[PDB]
């Protein structure tokens, strides 16, 4: 009897529910099937998270509240234990025995309670289709639609006895009045404040960015996150109280080694360390003091907040017995007088609240969604205002020249970090053309350490593999059915994995106008399915595309060719699938420019410098003399071919002599190099 | 049922997410499907879903349960 | 509530062992306030998996650790 008994209207009758907010048409609906006497019996659709459970407790607390009309009222609820359903059943039989006790117990509690049925799959059943189909039991379903899917199409006797609740799901400023609804539970249960534009903001970019759950159950534990997470940075111990902590501690274990003497006349000179022992116990222990204080306040508006509820607990209870007394005396009685003190607490809280905090605002909630997508909003000032002011330094410390490209990408990432971008858009879209010698993928290479410290998150893909038909099979997956179905493309999968990151293209000539119209999916709304069955989220990802078409002719064209021009024969092979929503919708068209020789010497400079990382694997150095130096300089360079015979220049040049005069065991460490000339052939001398 | 030919810039995709905003008050209720996705044979086991025996025979194509 | 995190990466980066000195850091009483004093066991599969050849038992084991 008991073992299956679960109601819940003791359950909000207890207050141990939480409220509803807004929901009346689908209760309307849902009493409307009540009153049904056959298939009268609903299930609810909806997705995860939409609050189907919600629903069915908040329809308990307008029974309790007796808000429900004539025909419902003294009905009762009892949800399923299908777990304690299955516990037990030693050998054939004993279940349905349990279960037509609960058929027989409905039946003798004669229309009293509405079942409820949660996790609908789980149910057997052989017994239920025919007091289903009388309509001799009251029922209540939920479940999702997948389950509706694989589960109930394929008995035909279900469906003719449930009825289908489209839970839809909240929008956005309905759930901002949920929350309104529920901020009071979570401040109790999570002792500290809540401002308002946390909760706007919290639906705002909760709906925005993360794509993948639904409202309102994201901002709800986005809220209950922060809320966590200050009230940990209030019980935890502060940071004027743990620094100084460590520094009292290492003043202890330094007074622990000098107050051991072993010369007390020469150790013992200590005074300097015990006189800034009693310096730092009374920093230490002032702060400390401050800090025992401030508990305490939040000690006690935690009492009087907890008080208050329990005045509102007993009104709610005088509600039940109509208590004139008790009703007038909570009105008026405890609550002006704890409003007086509450508030003057809370002014009160106004002066003493130095070191800690607790009033959770927008920041923090930046703070959240950047631990879980990785863009904060209010922290990259402090410290990365010193890479965004010496950005196009950072960048030229491993990229020389084309500072107009610089420029561009350098306005893309201040207008990501900004605030400026097209929420449907993605943050940068650009193609580099012109002629080469420039090294475009390095300066990929170097967004990718810039931003991500490494050259490994930059994920880059050839175009060149991509000119089959068989290619999108390739990167967005597979068709269903087939070989290669559930692995999907990895492009969507490394997006869906970590967002917000910088996507590599590469010399995109050689690939297919299907892969150019994903890619026009790509660059328009930043998004894009797959053959799985769902979408992925682009819009705060860098496309970049280098690409040859200028190369392909500019270094043959290298007089006449404009920017304009360059844009038309780049049209030849472009205009036929590339077209104005393609290239409308690229960003900026970046065409680069030959090589100064100076530049040329920087590079080679350059490149010294992981070689002497080389040399300090192994104990050397190399020195140059300038003309040295400039020989390199001056065979290095060629007009079509830019700087690029630099590097196997120099090493074919100089490393050949000095591996051999290295692997000859000629070579002592511990010594230098320096690189002579004797003659024109350069020659490295210890 | 509606074909739109034209230039670029003229707000085609502007104009259908104006009328899901105009009916259905959302640019998301539209439901958006590529045809350039689609040239090959296997596109009509993917929106519409597989034959027997197999996994998206099991789930079913876009526009099956979408509508 | 969401009171259980998933840890997501490649074998070996630590996940276990990111489990291992947390529940050190527990028994050094270096861990905030609340939790001090509070226990983590690991639960495993295979005890669990014992003979419920029969419907019914496996269910009512897991209910009763449940309790
Ligand atoms: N309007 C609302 N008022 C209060 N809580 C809500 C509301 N909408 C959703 N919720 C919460 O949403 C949570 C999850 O929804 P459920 O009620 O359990 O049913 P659901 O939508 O199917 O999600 P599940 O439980 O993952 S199947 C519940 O715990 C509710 O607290
Ligand atoms: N101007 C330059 N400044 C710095 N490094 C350069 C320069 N030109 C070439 N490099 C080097 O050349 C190598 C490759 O450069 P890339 O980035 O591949 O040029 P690229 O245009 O991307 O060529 P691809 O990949 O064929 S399109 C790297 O070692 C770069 O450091
Ligand atoms: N008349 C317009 N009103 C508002 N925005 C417009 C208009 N015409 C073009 N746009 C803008 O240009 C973009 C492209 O227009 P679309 O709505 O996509 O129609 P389109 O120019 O034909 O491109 P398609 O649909 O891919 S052929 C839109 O997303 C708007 O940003
Ligand atoms: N930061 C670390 N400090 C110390 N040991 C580490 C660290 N990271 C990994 N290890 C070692 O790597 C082993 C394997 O990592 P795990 O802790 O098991 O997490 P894991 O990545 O889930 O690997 P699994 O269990 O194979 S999936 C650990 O048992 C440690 O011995």
């Known amino acids: 009897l008991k073992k299956y008994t679960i109601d819940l209207t003791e359950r909000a009758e207890q207050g141990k529910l939480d409220p509803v907010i807004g929901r009346d048409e689908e209760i309307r609906r849902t009493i409307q099937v009540l009153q049904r006497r056959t298939k009268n019996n609903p299930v609810l659709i909806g997705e995860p998270g939409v609050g189907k459970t919600a629903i069915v407790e908040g329809l308990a607390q307008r029974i309790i509240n007796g808000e429900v009309p004539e025909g419902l009222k003294g009905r009762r609820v009892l949800a ?38 949660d996790a609908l799959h789980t149910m057997a059943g052989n017994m239920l289709k025919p007091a289903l189909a009388r309509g001799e039991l009251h029922c209540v379903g939920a479940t999702t639609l997948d389950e509706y899917r694989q589960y109930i199409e394929k008995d035909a006797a279900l469906e003719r006895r449930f009825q289908k609740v489209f839970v839809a799901e909240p929008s956005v400023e309905d759930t901002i009045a949920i929350l309104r609804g529920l901020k009071e539970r979570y401040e109790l249960h999570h002792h500290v404040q809540i401002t308002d534009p946390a909760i706007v903001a919290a639906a705002t970019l909760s709906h925005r960015y993360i794509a993948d759950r639904q409202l309102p159950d994201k901002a709800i ?47 013992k000179r200590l005074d300097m360390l015990n006189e800034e022992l009693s310096d730092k116990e009374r920093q230490y222990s002032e702060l400390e003091e401050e800090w025992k204080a401030e508990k305490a306040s ?47 607490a809370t002014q009160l809280e106004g002066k003493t609240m130095r070191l800690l905090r607790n009033k959770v605002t927008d920041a923090e909630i930046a703070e959240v969604l950047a631990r879980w997508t990785g863009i904060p909003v209010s922290r990259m000032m402090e410290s990365e205002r010193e890479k965004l002011l010496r950005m196009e330094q950072e960048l030229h410390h491993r990229v020389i020249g084309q500072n107009e490209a610089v420029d561009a990408v350098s306005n893309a990432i201040r207008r990501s970090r900004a605030g400026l971008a097209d929420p449907n858009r993605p943050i940068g879209s650009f193609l580099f053309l012109g002629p080469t010698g420039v090294g475009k993928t390095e300066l990929c290479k170097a967004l990718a350490n810039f931003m991500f410290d490494s050259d490994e998150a930059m994920v880059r893909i050839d175009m060149s593999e991509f000119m089959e038909k068989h290619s999108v099979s390739r990167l967005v997956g597979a068709p269903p059915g087939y070989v290669g179905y559930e692995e999907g493309g990895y492009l969507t999968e490394a997006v869906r994995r970590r967002p917000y990151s910088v996507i590599l293209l590469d010399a995109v000539e050689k690939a297919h106008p299907d892969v150019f119209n994903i890619l026009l999916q790509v660059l328009d709304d930043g998004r894009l399915t797959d053959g799985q069955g769902r979408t992925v989220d682009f819009r705060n990802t860098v496309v970049i595309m280098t690409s040859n078409l ?73 020195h140059i003399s300038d003309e040295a130096l400039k020989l390199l300089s001056e065979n290095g360079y060629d007009p079509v071919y830019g700087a690029r015979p630099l590097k196997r220049a120099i090493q074919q040049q100089i490393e050949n002599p000095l591996a051999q005069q290295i692997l000859s065991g000629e070579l002592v460490p511990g010594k230098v190099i320096r690189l002579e000339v004797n003659e024109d052939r350069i020659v490295a001398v210890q």
């Open 298 to 344: 939040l000690s006690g508006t935690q009492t009087i907040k907890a008080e208050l509820e329990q005045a509102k607990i007993a009104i709610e209870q005088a509600r039940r017995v109509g208590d004139l007394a008790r009703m007038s005396e909570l009105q008026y009685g405890k609550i002006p007088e704890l409003e007086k003190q509450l508030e003057a």
């Open 550 to 622: 200028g190369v392909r002719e500019t270094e043959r064209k290298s007089i006449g060719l404009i920017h304009q021009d360059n844009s038309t024969d780049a049209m030849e092979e472009i205009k036929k699938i590339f077209r104005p929503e393609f290239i409308n919708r690229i960003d900026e068209v970046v065409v680069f420019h030959p090589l100064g020789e100076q530049h040329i010497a920087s590079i080679a400079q350059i490149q010294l410098k992981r070689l002497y990382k080389r040399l300090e694997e192994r104990g050397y150095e190399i």
């Open 80 to 117: 399923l234990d299908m777990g304690a359903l299955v516990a037990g059943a030693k050998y054939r039989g004993e279940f349905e025995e349990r279960l037509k006790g609960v058929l027989n117990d409905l039946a003798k509690q004669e229309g009293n309670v509405i079942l409820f049925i």
């Open 221 to 267: 534990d986005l809220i209950d996150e922060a809320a966590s997470s200050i009230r940990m940075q209030i019980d935890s111990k502060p940071e004027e109280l743990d620094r100084l902590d460590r520094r009292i501690i290492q003043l202890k274990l330094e007074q622990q080694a000098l107050m051991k003497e072993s010369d007390e006349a020469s150790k």
